[PDB]
Amino acid sequence: MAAGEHWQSALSEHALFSSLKERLRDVEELREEGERRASKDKQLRNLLCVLDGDLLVWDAEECAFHTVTLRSLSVESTGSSSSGEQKLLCTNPPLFDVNEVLLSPTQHHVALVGSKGVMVLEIPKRWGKKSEFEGGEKTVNCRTIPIAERIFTSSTSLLLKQAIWYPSETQEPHLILLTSDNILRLYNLQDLFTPVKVISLSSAEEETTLPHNGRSYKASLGETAVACDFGPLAVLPKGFGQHSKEDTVAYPLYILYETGETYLMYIDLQKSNITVGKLLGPLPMYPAAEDNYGYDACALLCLPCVPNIIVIATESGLLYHCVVLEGEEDDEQTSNKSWNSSCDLIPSLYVFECVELELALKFATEEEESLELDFACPIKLHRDPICPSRYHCTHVAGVHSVGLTWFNKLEKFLSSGEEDKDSLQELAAEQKCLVEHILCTKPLRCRLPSPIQGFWIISDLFLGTSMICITCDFECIVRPLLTTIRPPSPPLLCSQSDKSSTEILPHVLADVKGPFEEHIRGILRRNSANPLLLNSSSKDSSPPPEECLQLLSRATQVFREEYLLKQDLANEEIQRRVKLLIAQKEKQLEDLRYCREERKSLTETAERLAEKFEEAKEKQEDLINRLKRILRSFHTSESERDMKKELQATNQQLQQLGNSINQVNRKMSYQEKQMEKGKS
Amino acid sequence: SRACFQVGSEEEKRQLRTESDGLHSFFLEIKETTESLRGEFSAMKIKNLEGFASIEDVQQRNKLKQDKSETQMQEIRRLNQYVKNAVQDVNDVLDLEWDQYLEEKQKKKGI
Amino acid sequence: TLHREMEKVKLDQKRLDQELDFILSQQKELEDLLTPLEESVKEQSGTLQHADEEREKTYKLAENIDAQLKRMAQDLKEVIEHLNTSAG
C-alpha cells in the first residue's frame, strides 16, 4: 500500500512541467496585448497519452512528445532528476494546432488531431536494458504521416469535428474522420490520399436521379454531426443481409447530431455488403421529453456494457444515460400503413437517467434573481478502462466522475427471466448515479478557468489506478482512483466468514431488512463532495465579500454534513459495538469459570460414586464368598456326574463356536472394508 | 484513530476457544466414565438380585426337605446347536459373496 | 450446550450414587439374613454335603452355559442381520 504514492508526487513535481511553464511564460511575454486576450480563451484539449507506463506529453511549440517513464519515478534513485526523459521529434511537424492525441488500438501509432488536419506519428521501437525508445536516445526522430492533407488545404471552410480509431486490435489501424460537411471518411495508413470508405450522413431519401455535387442541405440547415463512438463488436440483427446462415459481426457506430438526434451504423471493413454501412435512425428516444432532450449536444460516449449504454452530453452540463433497446418485430395486429417493405428493426434509446453537472461552484446568494449566467461549455467524455459503469467528464472549468450505480441491477434484471418482478421493483427503486466533482479549475467567479489540456486514466498493475490531469498552465495533478464506483467497506473485524455456522439467528432479527452494515452504509452515503480547488496562479489580485462568504458557507456545510457528522456517527457505532463486545467477553469468561467449577464438582462426585461402587462390589463378593462357603459346608448320582461332563463338553463346544463366529465376523468386516475400497 | 475498538487481545479469543474446547473434552470424559459406571452398577444390581433369588430357592428347598436340570440342559444344547447353525449359514453366505466378488474382479481385469 | 449436557450427566450420576447406596443396603440385609442360616446348617451338620455342593456347582455351570449359549445365539442373529443389511 505505501509504495504506490511516491510516483504521483514525483510526477506532479517533475522538471518537464516546470520547463513547459517557463516556455509558456516566455511565449506569453512575446505576444502582443490583443493576442494575450484571445490566448486566454484557452480551449479544452487532450494533448497527452500513456503507452506501456510512459507518459507522452505533446509540446505544441517544439512539435514533439516529451516522454516520462512513470515506473522509474517509483524507484527512490539517489541520482539526477533527469533519468528517463526522451523527446520524440516529428520528422514533418503538423501545419495545424493539435487539440487531441489518440493512441491507436495497436499502440504503434499516435494521431495528432486538429480542427484543420490530422497527422499520424509512428511510435519508435523500444529496445535496450530499460525498454526505452531507440535504446535510450535523448532525442528520437519519429516518422509522421499527414492524413487527407489536400482536403483540409483545398476546403478552407471544412472543419474536422472528431477523429476516432476503428476499434480493431488485429487489423491495420484505420482512422475515421467526422467533418463539418456531415461526411464520415475512413482512411488506411497505407493510402493517405484516398479514403477506403466515404459515407454521407445526409438521409438519401431524395432520390433525384442527378449524379453530381449534392452539398449536404442538412449541414447548411444547421444540423451538424458533432460526435460519434463505437460500441462493442455485436452480431447484426436478423434482416441485415438476405440469406447468409452466418452470424455476421460488425461494430455499431453511434452518431450524434447537435440536435440530440442519434443515429446508428454497422461498420465492418472486411465485408462490403450493402447493409453494412446503412445509416439507421434517428433512434427513437423514450420517454418523450417536452424539449426533445435539448439542442446543444456536444459529446457522445458508448460504454462497453451489455446492453450498450450511450452517454449524451450537452454544453449546459446535462448528461443523458441512454440504454440501447433492440427493436421489436411488430406483433401482426397494428398493420396500418408503412409501404416500405424493409422492416429494418431500428433500436430505441431509453433515457434511464438525466444528470446536471456543477460546471461552476453554486453559491447560495440571497438574490434568487441575479442572472444565472448559464456557464455552458463543451464537455469531453472519457471511458474508464477499470470500471465499465464509470466514466469521466473534462470541461474548461474542471473534471467530474460519473458512476452508474444502477448498472449491476440492470444487468441482474436483464439476466433474470420474465417472471422476476422483484428485480424490476429493485431497479425501479430510485437510484441516482454517483457524481463526484474531482477537480475545479474555476473555484471563484472573479477567476478565469484553467482549462484541461490533457486527461488520462492509468490502469497498470505496478503504478495502480490513477487519474492524470494537465492544465493550460502545465499544472500536473495526479489522483488515485478507486477500482469500483463504491469502495468495498473494510471488512468489520467481526465478519468471520465462517461458512460452518448455521447458527439459527433468532427470528426477531430477521425483520430488519438487510444486514445492519447496509443500513449504516445508507446513512454514510454521500451525494456531494468538495472538489480539489486549483488556485490559478494569476498573480495580480487577491480574490474579493458576500459571494466569498456564501462559497465558504457552502464548503463548510458540506464538510460538516458529509465528513464530520458521518465520522462522529461511525465513531459512536464503533464505540457501542466495542462496549457490547467487552460486556459479552466478560459474561463468556464468567460462564467459562462456572463450567470449569461444575466440571470439577461433577468429576469429584463421579470419583466418590466410583469409590462407593467398588466398596459395595467388594462387600457383595465377600457375601458371595461366604454363601459359597456355607453352600460347600452344606454339600459336604452317576447320571448327574455324566450330565455334568456332557454340559462341560457342550460349554467347550459353545466357546469354540463363539470363537469361530467371531473369526467369521472379523472376515466379513474385512471383506466389507475391501468392497468399500474397490468402489472408490 | 479516538475510536479504538480493541475487542480483546486476539489472544483472549484464542484462550477462550482453547478453554471451551478443553471443558468440552472434560465433559465428554465425565459423561463416558459416568455411563460406564452406570453400566457396572446395573450389572451388579442384577447379580445381587439373582444371588438373593438363588439363596431364597435354596432356603425354600431346605424348608420343604425338612417338612428339571435335564430339561434345562436339553434347552442349552438346542440353543448351542441353533447358534452353531446360524454361524455356519452366515459363513456359507459370506463364502458365496466372496466367490462372486472374485469372479467380478477377474472379469474386470480380463478387458 | 455443553453446560446443559454436563447438568444431565450430574443428575444421572446422582441417581447412580442413590442406586449404589440402595444395592449396598440390600447386600448388607442379605448378608445379615444369610449369616444365621449358614450357622444353622453348620450346627445341624455337627449333630450328602459334598453331593449337594457338587449338585449346586453343576447347576451354576449349566446356568452359565445356557446364558453363554443365549448370548452366542443373539450375537449370531445380529451378525446375520448386519450381513442382510450390508447385502441390501
Task: Pick the residue of A654, A671, A679 with the most B CBs within 10 A to test the interface with B by mutation.
Answer: A654
- Crossing angle of the two packed helices C49-86 and A638-677, in degrees rounded to 10: 20
A574 three-class SS: helix
* Contact criterion met (CB below 8 Å) for A471 and A453: yes
* C-beta atoms surrounding A647 within 10 Å: 23
Instruction: For chain C, count helices (H), then strands (E).
Output: 2, 0
- Number of continuous H segments (helices) and E segments (strands) in chain B: 2, 0
Element (H, E) at A323: strand A318-325
Q: How many angstroms is the resolution?
A: 6.9
Q: Which of residues 20-79 of B touch C (CB under 8 A)?
A: 20, 23-24, 27, 30-31, 34, 37-38, 41, 44-45, 48, 51-52, 55, 58-59, 62, 69, 72-73, 75-76, 79
Kindly list the residues from chain B whose CB atom is less than 8 angstroms away from the CB atom of residue C32. none
Phi-psi region of A109 (alpha: psi -120 to 50; beta: other; left: phi over 0): beta
Q: Which residue in B has a C-alpha nearest to residue A621's C-alpha?
A: B48
Name the amino acid, one letter, at B24: H
Range A204-232 burial, b when 16+ CB lie within 10 A, else e? eeeeeeeeeeeebebbeeebbbbbbbbbe
The grid coordinates listed for A499 are 461458512
Experimental method: cryo-EM
Radius of gyration of chain A measured on its C-alpha atoms: 40
What pairs with residue A187 in β-bridges? A175
Choose, out of A635, A639, A643, the residue to mutate when testing the contact with C (most C CBs < 10 Å): A635
Rounded-to-integer distance, Cα A461 and Cα A480, Å: 13
Torsion, Cα of A665, A666, A669, A671 (10° steps)? -110
Task: Determine the Cα–Cα distance for residues A391 and A425; give it in Å rounded to an integer.
Answer: 26
Closest CA to A99 of A159, A184, A149, A155: A159
From A87, A93, A91, select the one nearest A117 (Cα to Cα).
Answer: A93
Residue A78's alpha-carbon distances to A10, A206, A316, A463, A526, in angstroms, are 13, 71, 49, 20, 43
Chain B contact present for C6, CB below 8 A: yes
* Sign of the torsion formed by the C-alpha atoms of A273, A103, A463 and A475: negative
Would you call B94 an interface residue with chain C, using a CB distance cutoff of 8 Å?
A: yes
Residue A162: phi, psi to the nearest 5?
-150, 150
C23 contacts on B by Cβ (under 8 Å): 41, 44-45, 48
A62: CB partners within 8 A, 6+ apart: A87, A89
Going by C-alpha positions, the residue among A68, A69, A86 that lies closest to residue A140 is: A86
**Residues A187-195: contacts with CB under 8 Å, at least 24 apart:** A187/A147, A187/A148, A189/A109, A189/A120, A189/A145, A192/A145, A192/A146, A192/A147, A192/A148, A192/A149, A193/A148, A193/A150, A195/A148
Pick A575's closest partner by Cβ from B3, B51, B90: B3
| Secondary structure (3-state) at A230 | strand
Residue A249: all three cell numbers together: 459481426
Estimate the share of chain C in helix, then strand, then coil, as percent rounded to the nearest 5: 95, 0, 5
Best of C66, C82, C84 to mutate (most B CBs within 10 Å, chain B): C66
Given a contact cutoff of 8 angstroms between Cβ atoms, the answer to whether A256 and A312 are in contact is: yes
Q: What is the DSSP string of A427-482?
A: HHS--PPEEEEEEES--STTSPP--EEEEEEEEETTTEEEEEEEETT--EEEEE--
Using a CB-CB distance cutoff of 8 angstroms, which residues of chain B are in contact with residue C65? 76, 80
* b/e B10-40 (16+ beta carbons within 10 angstroms → b): eeeeeebeebeeebbebbeebbebbeebbee
Looking at the DSSP bridge assignments, the partners of residue A249 are A235
Nearest to A174 by CA among A185, A183, A182: A185
Query: Chain C closest CA to A613's CA: distance in Å?
Result: 6
Instruction: Quote the CA–CA distance of A604 and A597 in Å, as a whole number.
Output: 11
How far, in Å, CA of A309 to CA of A254, rounded?
11
Does residue A467 contact residue A488 with C-beta atoms inside 8 Å?
no
Count of A-B CB contacts under 8 Å: 101
Beta strands at A434-440 and A532-533: parallel, antiparallel or unpaired: parallel
Question: Please, which residues bridge with residue B66 across strands?
Answer: none
| Cα–chain center distance at A6 | 24
| Inter-chain residue contact C62 with B76, CB threshold 8 Å | yes
**In sequence order, which residues have a C-beta less than 8 Å from that of residue B108 and are 6 or more positions away?**
none
C-alpha pair distances (Å), A522 with each of A179, A515, A571 = 47, 11, 16
Sorted by sequence, the CB contacts under 8 Å of residue A374 that are 6+ apart come out as A316
Q: Which stretches of A326-404 are assigned E, i.e. beta strand? A: 348-356, 380-383, 390-395, 398-403
Contacts of C79 in chain B (CB under 8 A): 86-87, 90
CB distance A141 to A135 below 8 Å: no
Q: A89 near A141, Cβ under 8 Å?
A: yes
Please tell me what DSSP assigns to residue A134.
Answer: T
| Single-letter amino acid, residue A290 | E
Cis? peptide before A282, omega within 30° of 0: yes
Q: Mark yes or no for CB contact C83/A632 under 8 Å.
A: no
3-state secondary structure A234-301: EECCCCCCCCCCCCCEEEEEEEEECCCCEEEEEECCCCCCCCCCCEECCCCEECCCCCCCCCCEEEEE
Q: Tell me the CB-side half-sphere exposure of residue A393, using CA atoms within 13 A.
A: 34
- DSSP character at residue A644: H
CA–CA gap between residue A677 and residue A467 (Å, rounded): 61
> For the packed helices A565-635 and C2-45, what is the interaxial angle rounded to 10 degrees?
10
Question: Measured between CA atoms, how close is C72 to chain A, in angstroms?
Answer: 6
Q: Residue A209: helix, strand or coil by DSSP?
A: coil
- Spatial distance between the Cα atoms of A309 and A303, rounded to a whole number of angstroms: 5
Nearest-by-Cβ selection for B37 from A589, A610, A623? A610
Cell of B50: 439373582
User: Between A599, A636, A651, which is nearest C49 by CB?
Assistant: A636
